Symmetry: C3
Subunit: 308 residues, 3 copies
């Protein structure tokens, strides 16, 4: 099966025990909101919701998230199948921790570095194959495209103009620099550089990072001549404040039941949505009562993926 | 003299002894087709043709081809004279073997690697000159331009748009990457990379390589301030199936007796045709009877160069 | 104070003692032309002029010029303030010697190499700051833009098209290559490369270098997140032969009392003129009588800066 939707709950000392309930199947989650105090509201409002997804992860290690959501998609990529892993959820819920993780201790590193590590590990198990790895790192902010690995990465589209294009092989970004990474250390160094660059560019350009989408792309070529891309995506916060998410959610509604070019995000991800791609959605949610309404919104989104 | 036309015959256990005859002068070749069996045809059809070119090479070593067709043109380049060496002929006749040669034993390497070797050797004989070498590698396929040394060389013009341009110094390719090669090993590595890339791109883009033109360019700068280019060209098979050859043949007809921009090939080679260039044509022909008609077509083309 | 104007007199065995007089204040210079021999002219013509600038340097060492005109502006740059140092004056007066200096002995090196040296020295005094240095090198000639560090730097705008652009951060040059310099040796090597390239490009493109403007840009990023540029400018000779200077002089007249886009120079330097920049003008003048008229023209220009 090509599309998966998971939920990762953020750990908390103050878990909403009464309001958040995990199914025995480890795939279900039920939300029980507190009844409204207003007499007109309390007897007209739905307070209970049930959701069945591909997996629900709470108090899950980084190692376990990777094994569960990511490992297979990265495996299929060396065989020529495009894979996208996307983190979605409100600001603070755990998207960047899930995708990047701790930048200063191995055990707590996230999906993206483990993906790079797995690619190069896998290349060792295929000694008769000439496997070549390339990377790019793109930020989308307010309908503008930024190259996190460009030669002057703290200045905008005026200097480094980029345009999403399409060909028989998929969707690429004209102007977005593509870097050959011979070994995992080359790929790790570039991930570090682009992350440093992202931070500098947010300060330099007065961007709110909660509103940006970041897409790290691994381009694979192995020769049987095969090519693929793995897209590792940290989305803008879903609390819609960030318009482009609405086109992404609209797209996913359409696929379940599309103007891809209407939005940079949906255009960049066209090949990840319509058909020829292993899509994994990781839905980051708070475990606390005060965020339950945004949590339900995220879970309703997560729940659209089974119909795609 | 600025224009030379040679013929190289491909070696064969089944040579067409009755039908292919080499002149004593080592410059002539005569073709004697078999008479048609049809009564209306046999007494109205020309079966004998004679051709005089600058040299006819049969059962010739790689070392001898280089010394004969290429060596002088590469010499003149360090002195500031542009040089083009072009292989022409039907698919299977020996264009790629003549231009690239054996990629896995020194003795049988072709023109292109020997040219790179000669350039850097010559730089050693000129110790008071600061000589700088740069390279590019371009494939032309079906009126599209591809950079064999680009950062993502298995995707097309959509990502890496290129445009042939002209200035007081000649014709160049905007968007085509140009690589400084400090030593012969840097140039050899890039030739290897672009060749690997060509193969991957043919599989990835479903190109038939018999239909593509490939142009390796050596840009020389030596300081008396001098610049030159050496263009080493492996043309599309001449069996016209490949349209662009017809504009090249038309061009050469015109020069002997021009809309350069009508065709990418003729535009890219504008400076190699009209005037200020040492042009060497190497015409690759089969030695076998079954290919004699295409052989004659190639020799008629080869024979247009003496009038240029 | 943001704008400074200095004068550097070129040393001479034949100094114009009667006609050139230095004020005690080391900031003033007076010019006394020789009376015209024509009866109608001599009693209607001004022969005496006085000028007060920020400093007048005669028989000044390279070390002293740097300390006086440049040192502070380079200091302010690490703190986030943009700085431009510009050499102006007639061909032969000392612009290139002041800005580049002797390329073959340390003591006599000019402003530009000392600036690069000071930047990297200063980075050592700031061990808790991550400071990143980038460079570009641009020649402006006859309204065309050239990249002195491009991949084929002896061919023009046809291959390497560049466009001056503007954003909330200032004015940059789309298409102009930007090079990360990790250490002073990387920056020194690129300065050497671009200078070699400039010379080759002047011969190759038949440029008169007295008519070109050259702008070496140091891009600084330090993290408090700060960015700046230092622009080190060697202008075209002011003997106007070179049109673009007239728009620069017009601009400076306007600021003292603007169509920046009318001229590549003024557009490239927009951020150096209107407001947010530490501008230092170094006015190179001959010490000899035969050049006194061009000297006065330069000093009248130098004198416009105090009103900016
Ligand atoms: N599973 C988790 N375990 C421990 N800490 C987490 C986890 N998920 C998120 N956090 C922490 O919560 C904070 C917010 O997480 P982050 O990934 O930055 O949210 P988002 O990217 O969705 O805005 C971070 O300081 C991070 O350390
Ligand atoms: N002079 C030669 N000596 C030995 N083998 C040759 C020679 N010319 C061509 N060949 C062989 O013939 C085949 C076709 O040659 P190739 O150069 O690929 O043709 P083209 O490029 O014109 O299609 C190759 O396998 C090559 O090894
Ligand atoms: N202060 C100085 N001390 C010694 N020589 C100088 C000085 N200024 C200029 N020169 C010399 O004068 C010549 C012209 O100077 P240059 O800097 O090339 O002029 P410009 O760049 O203004 O045309 C050079 O040969 C240079 O060595
Ligand atoms: Cl963990
Ligand atoms: Cl041989
Ligand atoms: Cl000095
Ligand atoms: Mg985040
Ligand atoms: Mg071939
Ligand atoms: Mg000069």
């Amino acid at each position: 099966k090509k599309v998966h939707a998971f939920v990762r709950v953020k750990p908390t000392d103050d878990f909403a025990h009464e309001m958040i309930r995990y199914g025995d199947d480890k795939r279900s989650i039920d939300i029980h909101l507190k009844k409204d105090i207003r007499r007109g509201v309390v007897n007209n409002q739905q307070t209970d919701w049930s959701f069945k997804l591909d997996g629900v992860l709470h108090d899950a290690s980084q190692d376990l998230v990777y094994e569960t959501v990511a490992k297979d998609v990265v495996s299929q990529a060396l065989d020529g199948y495009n894979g996208t892993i996307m983190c979605y959820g409100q600001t603070g819920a755990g998207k960047t921790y899930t995708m990047m993780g701790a930048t200063e201790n191995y055990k707590h590193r996230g999906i993206l570095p483990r993906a790079l590590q797995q690619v190069f590990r896998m290349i060792e198990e295929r000694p008769t194959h000439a496997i070549t790895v390339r990377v790019s790192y793109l930020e989308i902010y307010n309908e503008s495209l930024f190259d996190l690995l460009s030669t002057l990465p703290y200045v905008g589209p005026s200097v480094t103009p980029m345009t999403i294009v399409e060909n028989p092989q998929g969707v690429f970004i004209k102007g977005l620099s593509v870097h050959l990474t011979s070994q995992e250390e080359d790929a790790f160094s570039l991930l570090f550089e682009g992350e440093t660059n992202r931070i500098i560019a947010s300060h330099t350009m007065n961007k709110n990072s909660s509103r940006s989408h970041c897409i790290f792309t691994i381009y694979l070529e192995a020769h049987k001549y095969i090519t693929s891309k793995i897209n590792l995506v940290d989305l803008a916060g879903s609390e819609y404040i960030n318009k482009s998410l609405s086109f992404l959610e609209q797209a996913i509604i359409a696929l379940g039941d599309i103007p891809f070019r209407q939005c940079k995000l949906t255009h960049a991800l066209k090949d990840s949505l319509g058909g020829n791609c292993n899509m994994v959605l990781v839905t980051n949610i708070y475990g606390e009562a005060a965020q339950l309404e945004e949590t339900l919104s995220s879970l309703r989104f997560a729940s659209r993926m089974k119909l795609v």
